[PDB]
Design a protein around this ligand. Sequence first.
Ligand code: NA
Ligand code: NA
Ligand code: NA
Ligand code: NA
Lengths: 283, 283, 283, 283
Amino acid sequence: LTESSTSKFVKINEKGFSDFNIHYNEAGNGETVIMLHGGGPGAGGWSNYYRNVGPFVDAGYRVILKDSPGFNKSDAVVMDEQRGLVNARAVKGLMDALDIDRAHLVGNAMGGATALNFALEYPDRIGKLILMGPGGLGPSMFAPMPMEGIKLLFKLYAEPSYETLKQMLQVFLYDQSLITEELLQGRWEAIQRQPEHLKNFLISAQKAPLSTWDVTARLGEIKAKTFITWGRDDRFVPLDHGLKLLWNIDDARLHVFSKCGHWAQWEHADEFNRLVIDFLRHA
Amino acid sequence: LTESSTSKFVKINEKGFSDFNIHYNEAGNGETVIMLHGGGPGAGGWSNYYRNVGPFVDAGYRVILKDSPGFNKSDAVVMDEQRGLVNARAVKGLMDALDIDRAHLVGNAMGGATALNFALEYPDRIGKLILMGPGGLGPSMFAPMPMEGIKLLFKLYAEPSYETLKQMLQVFLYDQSLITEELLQGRWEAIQRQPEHLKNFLISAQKAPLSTWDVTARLGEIKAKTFITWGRDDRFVPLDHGLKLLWNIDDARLHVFSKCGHWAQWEHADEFNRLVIDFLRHA
Amino acid sequence: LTESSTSKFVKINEKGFSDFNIHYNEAGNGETVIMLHGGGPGAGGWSNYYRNVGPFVDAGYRVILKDSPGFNKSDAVVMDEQRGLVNARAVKGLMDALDIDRAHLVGNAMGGATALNFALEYPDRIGKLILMGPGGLGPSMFAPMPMEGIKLLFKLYAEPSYETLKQMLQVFLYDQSLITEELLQGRWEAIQRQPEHLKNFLISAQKAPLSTWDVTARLGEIKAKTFITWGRDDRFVPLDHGLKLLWNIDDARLHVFSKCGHWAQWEHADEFNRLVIDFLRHA
Amino acid sequence: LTESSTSKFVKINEKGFSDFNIHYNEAGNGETVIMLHGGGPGAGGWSNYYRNVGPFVDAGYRVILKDSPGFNKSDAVVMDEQRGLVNARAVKGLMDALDIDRAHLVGNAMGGATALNFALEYPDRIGKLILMGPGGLGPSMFAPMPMEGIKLLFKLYAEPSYETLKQMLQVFLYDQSLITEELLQGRWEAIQRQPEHLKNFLISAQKAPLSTWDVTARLGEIKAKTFITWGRDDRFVPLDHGLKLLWNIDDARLHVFSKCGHWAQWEHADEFNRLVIDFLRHA
Ligand code: NA
Ligand code: NA
Ligand code: NA
Ligand code: NA
């Protein structure tokens, strides 16, 4: 499987979205699992999940790596509402366009916020819910905010440079030996390729700051069986939010990886794939 | 598999122990996994693990459910050293007697303390390390100590009664509908059958209080790949100790079950078995 | 100052309350400080605060130790709304009746919930806000709930006895040598004297469980300078809620006493009085 | 009081130190309080404590703002042991030279580590112990380490620049409007004035990394009445270490300031002075 061979586009129409172009990468043909990426400059579906797509397809799932609005090859957008909600409407729009009745959701960071909002807004359209360091869940009980990684994400959006990208990735990942030239060049290309996305992210964030993303008060509504992952060493979203989710969602479990930053599905791909596939099959 | 069909005895000889009788329940014939039980009145190997033995044997392991010294059908003993250490010497004595070179250890509560001490004292004799709410790891950062469940454990040791047993089990388990007459009668029988164990546990605890069990300072020595489980709702050992282990052991992961007290392998048997078998096979 | 010499009654009229009798103990004549007691069987203003009234009066304050509705010498009541809110309406009713424009509030446990609700509902009527282990702030990130002490409080309400009272007080206080016959007899008398309050508390709790008291989502509205105290060893309300308040109220500080249960103003009276008087004078 | 009018030098002789020059700023003549500064480039006694010296002297104390070895106007040094311990020997050497029998200690960050080590090594020479975000207390249960601020401290030591200084101070302080030109110029001057201190700090840290400073296991030895302060928003040392100290030192209390970084005595000078003076007078 490659980015090119799996690449697809679909126009969506859903509250606010009109003939809005969504790029996604699709492989497999079984039950649908939609994987949703983080919010850093240059993020996208394939980039975030290329270590996960193969094993999930092998396990029998249809995998859709979705580019959220204002990221990668999806259409540019300026949002005036919290991004998790707007992103979730876009997931529903994609599912309606593709005739998908229910999907399992896997959501990393901003994508975790997207997945939580989808579960809340469209409970009849979700199967299981998988969350990796989801963002926006209000204050931490321990971590000063904005968190270290989030400050870097905003710096890179406002003043993109290869050096600042490297600085962000150093904080993003626990193991520094994972920061290859391939990783750096790929992220830099995605940043260079769509400067409009960077500008629009910042305009959006002024319209709806992260303090407006907090869905904590509604977590008791979630009936989806939920699997929460955290990196012990995540400098972008605080570890205690994994506990927050565990206490507030009816049927959740929490798995924390040691020596792991904000990209658990990539940093601990083998264990992540095994745990999440097991969860989807048997939970 | 039944308690009767799996029951075995072996005499051990290891630092302090001389011709000391250890009862255990054994099934299977593959790689050895020794499961170690908690320290409550009436605890024993079969009692603690009868929901786990079958699936582990099915997966290809030789399972040994060991009765620790001063519990169930093992010999009575008064200990003047911290129980985790004394128990670990007994595990080594069992392994030497049975010609087992290396074992995977699964340790619940007192058994978790036993497993940690074994890993520290005999690093060449352990495979993987699995811990479920291990005891003795010093103070909590959040929970007043002694913890609610531990106060009940000491009350029941000092004044055994069916009513106090029921009170303990109510705190021990999250889901109250798991407290069947079968569970109550079984635990009560084990308590009635060996009053000497109750007396000796209390004498031992005066000689070496729980404050002497803390092995925290040595956790950096552990090289075994480690899987830590906690019940979100554990009233016997504090949740933050799962984080303590995760930060201090080199290669650990932490899995926390929702709606789960101090007997995770029984309260969440299906998910526990799947996760731990996966860990042993693939980690 | 004695309970008898300070005792007063006032009828209040405020949303729902009509000619409702409130008992309080008053001393001093300076700026008003209203102290609000916890929700355990037999609780009352004088009982809860008799170690604080003198020093606060000496410092120049008018101190009002208020009995909340359905406690001590205040009128019996069955509430169908969360108690913090109903109690706060009663504080406003008292203040209107006594021509008090603004009061500093000191609130222990249920009284802390009362004080938070008052600050939210009547921001123009509060000076400073002092909270000692306030209840109802939703789930803990660490403590299984209901907390140990709260289970005992409900047991004692449903089946009042001198033995169960002693059991509660043992959990309520860190230092067991504070549990004198005077303390036990006083609490028992207050329980025996008004059995109707016990019955009504339970009926009220069925109508509006503690899960309905959570005001967390509104904490950002509080503009009062706030001083939060916690007992390190509080088995009734979880320590992490002190952090919750510290992160969510604009201008707060948190003081945690070691060797201290759920009655900080009594267990650590000297340090409490000094800190809170300093806060009122200088903050 | 000014830096110039209070400036003094004394040669110390104590295990390892021989005719070693210590600079300090002294005012007042009552009971001695020695204040100990943090470990950032350009730190010193006067710099760290000039908002505290006056009020403490007014309260009747003799205040000594000590420059630790390898800082400010004290002699340059390369240490091969953990700095808290070496610093504590230097405090004892100062006290012996000045004929001070016992001192109260106030210790910020590295200075907190110094104060803890002094309390452990010389229990007969300390009065009360005051700690503000003390360093070196091992891992956090929540914060990825090295902490954000500590990474910046090492960056500034290795590559001193005015821009990197400003970056550090932005993380050091909660309120950005406290970062005046006066603050920046003062810190920069202290950095420019003694480049040898920067080089030596780095050589020392290679000889004895922060992982060797952890005195956690010995905290039960401390008999000094202890007052612990933390900034809620401290990005240099983790908030949960305040709890660690509170649980492990016999007689401690914890005060946490909101909207406060790693320089609590300066960021919240008025409340800090009042609380600590009250503690020294009455605790
Ligand atoms: Na490699
Ligand atoms: Na059933
Ligand atoms: Na006494
Ligand atoms: Na100003």
